[PDB]
Amino acid sequence: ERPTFYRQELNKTIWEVPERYQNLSPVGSVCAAFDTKTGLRVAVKKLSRPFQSIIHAKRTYRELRLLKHMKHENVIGLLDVFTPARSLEEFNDVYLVTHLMGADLNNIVKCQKLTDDHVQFLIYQILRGLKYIHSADIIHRDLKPSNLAVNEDCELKILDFGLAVATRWYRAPEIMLNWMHYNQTVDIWSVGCIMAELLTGRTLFPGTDHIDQLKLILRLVGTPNYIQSLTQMPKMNFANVFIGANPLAVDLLEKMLVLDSDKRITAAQALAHAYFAQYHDPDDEPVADPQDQSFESRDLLIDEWKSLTYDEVISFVPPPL
Ligand SMILES: CCCCCCCCO[C@@H]1O[C@H](CO)[C@@H](O)[C@H](O)[C@H]1O
């Protein structure tokens, strides 16, 4: 049951891992390995400093639990979680294992010319995935082409949250102006820009800095403070803009790239949209199981949070095959 572990020096860090994980190679805390058992390419993350203090011990607990909970075909899943520790008394480090995908959306877009057929399929999957994360009270906030992975079968997974500027390009306006209580539809704005890049092959808002990213946005959607001082920009007609896009692609877009986060279509509404008629299937578009958050109101010592995390690691069961 317990694997043989081996040890290794990598970026001034000694990694200790089960012997199934071979060829460890860091990228930028995170190593790519080859899982000889499963013949699968994997990423292995070793956690930075769990149990650092009390607020981290607790954050490590909460987020491990959130991650264990993820089970959906369009969302990164946990293949494995382990520690070389042989007892709670010596438990310090925690390792996470997920599979490494092969391609992602940015390397794809920068190499091949997609048809509307390809686009409809990719976005459906992204939205189906987004429906699920949102339903689990999560707000991803860095949705970008490089963190949208696709494997051989063209199955796409959303990758990069509770885990780890090209991002500013896909960021919702309200996220750049330090709103404090922003909405889940910040993620739908991201989808809209990704979608626009799929339809055309080009970056919609390739802006350098904050205010300038924003000048570029105003130039598409027209002007809605330092804004009561910004130039008059009239609203562009999206059909005149996206020369080729299925007029259904354009209507969905018109509803994603809206400034008022209150009027922006949700993940669930967008799935029901006529652009997705061939894939839309309401009885296989599931939401997250309720999770218990009793611990959320507990006030324990660091070795209690560590005790609990330990027990989560130990109890983890991997995906069947
Ligand atoms: C220069 C334009 C910047 C963006 C304009 C408004 C962005 C989103 O809109 C606003 O965002 C808030 C948080 O999500 C909400 O509380 C507001 O009700 C909503 O209208």
Swiss-Prot record:
Keywords: Acetylation, Apoptosis, ATP-binding, Cytoplasm, Kinase, Nucleotide-binding, Nucleus, Phosphoprotein, Serine/threonine-protein kinase, Stress response, Transcription, Transcription regulation, Transferase, Ubl conjugation. InterPro entries: Kinase-like_dom_sf, MAP_kinase, MAP_kinase_CS, MAPK14, MAPK_p38-like, Prot_kinase_dom, Protein_kinase_ATP_BS. Changing residue 160 to A: Loss of kinase activity. Serine/threonine kinase which acts as an essential component of the MAP kinase signal transduction pathway. MAPK14 is one of the four p38 MAPKs which play an important role in the cascades of cellular responses evoked by extracellular stimuli such as pro-inflammatory cytokines or physical stress leading to direct activation of transcription factors. Accordingly, p38 MAPKs phosphorylate a broad range of proteins and it has been estimated that they may have approximately 200 to 300 substrates each. Belongs to the protein kinase superfamily. CMGC Ser/Thr protein kinase family. MAP kinase subfamily. Residues 21-276 form the Protein kinase domain. It comes from Homo sapiens. Activated by cell stresses such as DNA damage, heat shock, osmotic shock, anisomycin and sodium arsenite, as well as pro-inflammatory stimuli such as bacterial lipopolysaccharide (LPS) and interleukin-1. The gene is MAPK14. GO terms for molecular function: ATP binding; enzyme binding; MAP kinase activity; MAP kinase kinase activity; mitogen-activated protein kinase p38 binding; NFAT protein binding; protein phosphatase binding; protein serine kinase activity. The lineage of its organism: Eukaryota, Metazoa, Chordata, Craniata, Vertebrata. GO terms for biological process: 3'-UTR-mediated mRNA stabilization; angiogenesis; apoptotic process; bone development; cartilage condensation; cell morphogenesis; cell surface receptor protein serine/threonine kinase signaling pathway; cell surface receptor signaling pathway. Changing residue 46 to R: Impairs MAP2K6/MKK6-dependent autophosphorylation. Dual phosphorylation can also be mediated by TAB1-mediated autophosphorylation. Dephosphorylated and inactivated by DUPS1, DUSP10 and DUSP16. PPM1D also mediates dephosphorylation and inactivation of MAPK14. Acetylated at Lys-45 and Lys-144 by KAT2B and EP300. Acetylation at Lys-45 increases the affinity for ATP and enhances kinase activity. Lys-45 and Lys-144 are deacetylated by HDAC3. CDD domains: STKc_p38alpha. It is an enzyme of class 2 (transferase). The modification Phosphothreonine is found at residues 13, 231. This is Mitogen-activated protein kinase 14. The keyword Disulfide bond does not apply. PROSITE patterns: MAPK (PS01351), PROTEIN_KINASE_ATP (PS00107), PROTEIN_KINASE_DOM (PS50011). It catalyses: L-seryl-[protein] + ATP = O-phospho-L-seryl-[protein] + ADP + H(+); L-threonyl-[protein] + ATP = O-phospho-L-threonyl-[protein] + ADP + H(+). One of its GO terms (cellular component) is glutamatergic synapse. Its cofactor is Mg(2+). The TXY motif contains the threonine and tyrosine residues whose phosphorylation activates the MAP kinases.
